């Protein structure tokens, strides 16, 4: 919400931390769900 | 008299810590320089390092 | 320097907004900032009335053209300059000026109707798009078509997330110059975008493709803010207090009288109100004289004002809106106080600054912009004349061939006497010439002077008196 | 002297302010108060406004050059002075309107757009920076591009502390002169780093590469403050009492009225307001058509609230806020709340002359700085190229003397009076007599003198030339 | 690293850790070494 990037596809950021050591760390996040309006235009066989 | 606000105490003490600091590392420095003189060889040594 | 401090009693000490530059601080909440204002466009009395003000004030009901190229600069002379410039200007008005209205692809808009909505367009939504393109199963002299995209449909591909090249659809280069816009699709029997495609702001051949036209105020900004965002929430909060207080006047108004006593829910109305029954609908004819046993009762209410000091309240929000979108007071809100002349005439001069510098800017830019991009095409199929001995070719110059100046409607005065009186006194004196005073009421002076040479020569064909302006 | 102790009957004891330099007093929260005037003008009615003022009243719609270089003193003579006059005007005229807007690298504004948002920038920030630029690839006459950049970009390297030489990225020499700036690179998305170059404010031989323009209020500054510092506070709280004032009347005129019963929760909706139980925790709705009498039982009443005025007085204490802000800010009370009550000619023409006097000050400093600066870096690049011609037998070359070569004067709009014939008459008087020429008559209309004596020689040759009658001006 | 510094001199930061206390911190690192090219140029004696 900082930045306002909301129900997107692959939000990324990237940041540091604080303390003598400093680390910087690289995160990308999505939330994937594939779906079917209709579940049936297809047939799977399964050969031999 | 006079005095200053809470915040302006702030921005001598910060000042003074960073002129320590540049201080500290300028005798390293020249402890490092001197001692590479008198003897051929010096050593860095400390307690975490 | 207490701005910059905790405040006067420590009130400030909360208010610390972030020192963000402009695209970090319109981006992430564009698109509800763009629906909010088409909301408030299509949904309010006053934000229409702003939008029909902007439009019939800036461009009027006629965009005229007068082309005017630097002769000099091209070393071409004088008359050629002159032949040059009419048949140009010929040519434009029959395209431009089509019945069937074949300037633009969807066929629904003229040339006029096109820049109108374009202010329109950048009135609410802070940006116009216009998209140049050829037709070439058309048999017509053209093949120019213009057409206009909206501000919405200008998105990244896939609705990925932002990068540093690529901000809100708009690829950029080393510098903050655009390079292309990435355009969607519509489908209307559906919901948000499914097609994405690429269209280059500018052809190889350095001729226009993609139009895009803003007024910028940070350093870098790569898509522009509607003007609404000063008084989006006042319009809206406005709109709730009227709402609210019609509804609250109609309630209190409703309920007339008020029937006490201890008799039935029927007999109460039979015998007090004297609505027959034998709840009970009451005959509105004649004056009744009820007569009440001692535990009966009947009270007749008395409402509250029903403008309580709402209209005043009214008056200064109005003139908070009206501060924040441009138009002035008067024109926003149709009051018109019992005033002076010096006033009115200080109002609309104060409107008639705004309204000409965005007539200046904006539709000055995108029709010049598109007159260019017709004129290649036109010096392409040699329907005009290029002069002999011309130093740069067409590319070289662009802008010094193609070199023109729009004329709107003029302002309508308060005493039609006292501009003409103006223009008569300025004429008389070498202060002004006849080009400015018939531009200021928006006619070409060498249409006039064709006109009247021949009113003079129909005149004198037919045996009148002669008329002032021809000379014996 | 009372001023410098306790007060009346001690009153002021309190207040005892530092006495510390300008910069002491502005540079500690310079950013934090650049952020609330932004904050300021991005969402406030007025604030815009007087925006919007500042820029179509100090510019317009066209700023006009004047090139009137001093023969004089160069001494050099009067009609090849005119020839390279009018050369360079055409030039400047052709490169400023180009409408491909190449002027400067974003391809965004042209020559007045460019100064308009200098004027806004100086308004609510106290500095503009125009910088100057190359493009080796760029094959056009002219390489020469101007590039505007916001205030917020300059700042100390790597966020380091302040020192005796470098004040907010602007280097400092012995002198209070500066010497180079710090600018910064800002990216749109926040996680990638930035970059901090260091540009000098004048090349090596002649020319300037890095624009700083701003008035001193005091002697030491190095970055100005803008005009809001007065007057943010007033602005902010009069936001927060007309948001809080409408909140209030919305909520006082909302509930129309009262029940009071001991039934049931929906009986007495039923019985009184007169709703529908309907045959198939919500509330009952009500029909709005008629006029209804509920019968009341002795348990039950009813309470037709009577609510506070709408507006008690708050259009007066607006007044009093608003003459407090258009007196900090400089522009008059009717150009800014838009009120325009009655009053007679005297009082409107007052006003306008007390308003127009400010605005001709920022036109003469601000744009006029900017505007002649911008043109001496592109007049750089007219001679070097040739496109240009210096006279002969001149007493020094282009840059010894750049002021006395690249002299000039700006035409902006003028003043739309508030009478019409009184002005013009005016105007006619003055020209009847010797007190005036035709330059200062003109230009207060905005136009150069040339131009209408030239339009004025064509349209006597037309008029002529279509059998018309002969224009007033022409000469027997 | 990040700002594009590398192989100074006194690189100086601070940053404040939102502790309960709160805090903002103060540092500088160099890394320093001081070298000599020809080592018995000079002559060291005691003088007891």
């Given at each position: ?48 | ?49 | ?104 692809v ?23 798009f216009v998209q140049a393109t050829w037709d070439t ?6 093949r120019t078509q213009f057409r206009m995209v909206?501000?919405?449909?200008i ?15 708009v690829q ?5 110059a655009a390079l292309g816009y990435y355009v ?13 495609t690429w269209i280059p702001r500018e052809l190889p051949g350095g001729r226009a493709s993609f139009i895009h036209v ?152 995108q029709?010049?912009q598109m007159?260019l991009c017709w004129l290649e095409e ?20 662009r ?74």
């Amino acid at each position: 919400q900082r930045e306002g990037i909301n129900a997107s596809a692959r939000y990324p950021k990237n940041w540091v931390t604080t303390g003598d050591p400093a680390r910087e760390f690289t995160m990308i996040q999505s939330a994937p769900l594939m779906l079917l309006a209709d579940p049936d235009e297809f047939v799977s066989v399964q050969l031999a | 008299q006079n005095l200053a606000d809470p915040a302006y105490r702030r921005r001598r003490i910060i000042m003074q810590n960073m002129r320590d600091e540049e201080l500290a590392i300028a005798q390293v420095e020249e402890m490092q320089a001197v001692s590479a003189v008198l003897k051929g060889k010096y050593t860095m040594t400390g307690e975490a390092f | 320097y207490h701005g910059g401090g905790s405040g006067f009693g420590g009130q400030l000490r909360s208010w610390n907004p972030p020192s963000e530059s402009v695209d970090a601080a319109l981006l992430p909440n564009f698109t509800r900032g763009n629906a909010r204002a088409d909301d408030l466009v299509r949904n309010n009395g006053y934000a229409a009335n702003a939008i029909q003000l902007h439009q019939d004030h800036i461009v009027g009901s006629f965009f005229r053209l007068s082309h005017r190229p630097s002769w000099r600069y091209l070393g071409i002379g004088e008359e050629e300059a002159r032949a040059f410039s009419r048949e140009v200007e010929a040519a434009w008005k029959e395209f431009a000026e089509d019945d069937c209205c074949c300037i633009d692809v969807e066929r629904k808009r003229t040339f006029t109707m096109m820049i109108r909505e374009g202010v329109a367009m950048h009135a609410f939504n802070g940006e116009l798009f216009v998209q140049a393109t050829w037709d070439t199963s058309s048999s017509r002299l053209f093949r120019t078509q213009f057409r206009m995209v909206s501000p919405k449909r200008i998105s990244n591909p896939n609705n990925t997330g932002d990068s540093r090249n690529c901000r809100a659809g708009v690829q950029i280069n080393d510098s903050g110059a655009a390079l292309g816009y990435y355009v969607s699709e519509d489908g209307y029997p559906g919901w948000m975008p499914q097609k994405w495609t690429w269209i280059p702001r500018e052809l190889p051949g350095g001729r226009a493709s993609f139009i895009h036209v803003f007024e910028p105020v940070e350093d870098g900004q790569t898509r522009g803010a509607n003007v609404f965002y000063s008084v989006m929430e006042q319009m809206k909060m406005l709109d709730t207090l009227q709402n609210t207080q019609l509804q609250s006047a109609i309630v209190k108004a409703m309920y007339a009288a008020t029937i006490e006593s201890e008799l039935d829910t029927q007999s109460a109305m039979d015998f007090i109100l004297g609505a027959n029954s034998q709840a009970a609908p009451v005959r509105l004819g004649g004056a009744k004289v009820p007569h009440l046993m001692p535990g009966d009762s009947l009270n007749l209410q008395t409402a509250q004002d029903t403008d309580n000091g709402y209209s005043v309240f009214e008056q200064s929000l109005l003139r908070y809106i009206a501060a924040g979108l441009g138009v002035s007071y008067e024109q926003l809100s149709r009051n018109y106080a019992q005033m002076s002349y010096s006033t009115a005439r200080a109002s609309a001069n104060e409107s008639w600054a705004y309204f000409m510098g965005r007539r200046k800017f904006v539709a000055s830019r995108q029709a010049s912009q598109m007159f260019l991009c017709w004129l290649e095409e036109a010096i392409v199929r040699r329907v005009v004349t290029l002069p002999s001995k011309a130093r740069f070719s067409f590319q070289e110059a662009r802008s010094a061939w193609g070199n023109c100046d729009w004329i709107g409607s003029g302002r309508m005065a308060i005493d039609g006497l006292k501009e003409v009186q103006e223009a008569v006194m300025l004429i008389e004196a070498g202060l002004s010439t006849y080009e400015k005073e018939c531009a200021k009421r928006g006619d070409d002076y060498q249409e006039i002077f064709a006109q009247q040479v021949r009113e003079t020569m129909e005149r004198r064909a037919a045996g009148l008196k002669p008329p002032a302006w021809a000379a014996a």
